[PDB]
Design a protein around this ligand. Structure first.
Ligand SMILES: OC[C@H]1O[C@@H](O)[C@H](O)[C@@H](O)[C@@H]1O
Ligand SMILES: [Ca+2]
Length: 305
């Protein structure tokens, strides 16, 4: 069976571990041919790749959109040919999911990573009283946001502060800006914050993902401000190493392996005419499979590395 898969950007670091896990699953299954494509962060690039995949007779499509709003376009191309589409990681509109009977989504509940990240910061702030540099009881922080409009970026930006507040901890946002899920852009942005007027007031660096966290970690050691706690989201192998050295204070596992497994399992099922979850233990709720995030810090780190 031929399954065509598009990854919105191959050098997105979390999409790179998903991509690779998708490939290992496809190679262990002797009756499947996966046709992998890098959309290069361009939705028209992706749109033309879905035409070639359909021209090639694929039986199911697993699509990681560059734009969440291109879902309708992708469904209309798949529909003419009655082909299943499993959208994964960037969530389409509920109404776009509902417009096609064979459209499914594999993701996470975005909200939950922001809540867990807020609980990590609350636990380590209570425990590390010296992180309150100006001794006022409030967290003065900077936030590195992902793509504006992206469901994960927006929920993680909102729910980390809501959770801290809910856990009794008042916050003061010194600065927030997007570095668009990227290491080098977050390095620049942190360097700039550390070269500006409130470099001395920054107590906590909160980032919506690990690639950006790692960028802030190297702007922060360049200014020898290696003592500022940095939190991220995803539990990338490289970030677990920093959590281990203490250069980062915590992460949230974004489970690349089971989301890649669920995408593979539903796309092959649907490609073979079976029910989306047949023979699987995936719980599909309203065409959606949501995999859980897990909080990770020095105390439960041995479960991850
Ligand atoms: O859409 C891609 C993005 O999805 C998020 O869930 C991850 O945390 C990001 O690091 C990733 O780049
Ligand atoms: Ca403070």
């Amino acid at each position: 069976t031929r399954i065509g898969v598009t990854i919105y950007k191959y050098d997105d670091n979390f999409m790179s571990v998903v991509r690779k896990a998708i490939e290992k699953d496809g190679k262990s299954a002797p009756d499947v041919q996966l046709l992998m494509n890098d959309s290069q962060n361009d939705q028209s690039k992706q749109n033309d790749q879905i035409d070639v995949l359909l021209a090639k007779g694929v039986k199911a499509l697993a699509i990681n959109l560059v734009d969440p709003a291109a879902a309708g376009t992708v469904i209309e191309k798949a529909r003419g040919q009655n082909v299943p589409v499993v959208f994964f990681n960037k969530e389409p509109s509920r109404k776009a999911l509902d417009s096609y009977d064979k459209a499914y989504y594999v993701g996470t509940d975005s909200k939950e990573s922001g809540v867990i990240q807020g609980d990590l910061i609350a636990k380590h702030w209570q425990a590390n009283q010296g992180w309150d540099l100006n001794k006022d009881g409030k967290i003065q922080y900077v936030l590195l946001k992902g793509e504006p409009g992206h469901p994960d970026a927006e929920a993680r930006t909102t729910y980390v502060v809501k959770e801290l507040n809910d856990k009794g901890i008042q916050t003061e946002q010194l600065a927030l800006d997007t570095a668009m899920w990227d290491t080098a852009q977050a390095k620049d942005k942190m360097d700039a914050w550390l070269s500006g007027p409130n470099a001395n007031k920054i107590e906590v660096v909160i980032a919506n993902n690990d690639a950006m966290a790692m960028g802030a970690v190297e702007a922060l050691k360049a200014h020898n401000k290696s003592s500022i706690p940095v939190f991220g989201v995803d539990a990338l192998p490289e970030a677990l190493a920093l959590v281990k050295s203490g250069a980062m204070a915590g992460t949230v596992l974004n489970d690349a392996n089971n989301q890649a497994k669920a995408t593979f399992d539903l796309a092959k099922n649907l490609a073979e005419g079976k029910g989306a979850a047949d023979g699987t233990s995936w719980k599909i709720e309203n065409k959606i499979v949501r995999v859980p995030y897990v909080g990770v810090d020095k105390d439960n780190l041995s479960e991850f590395t």
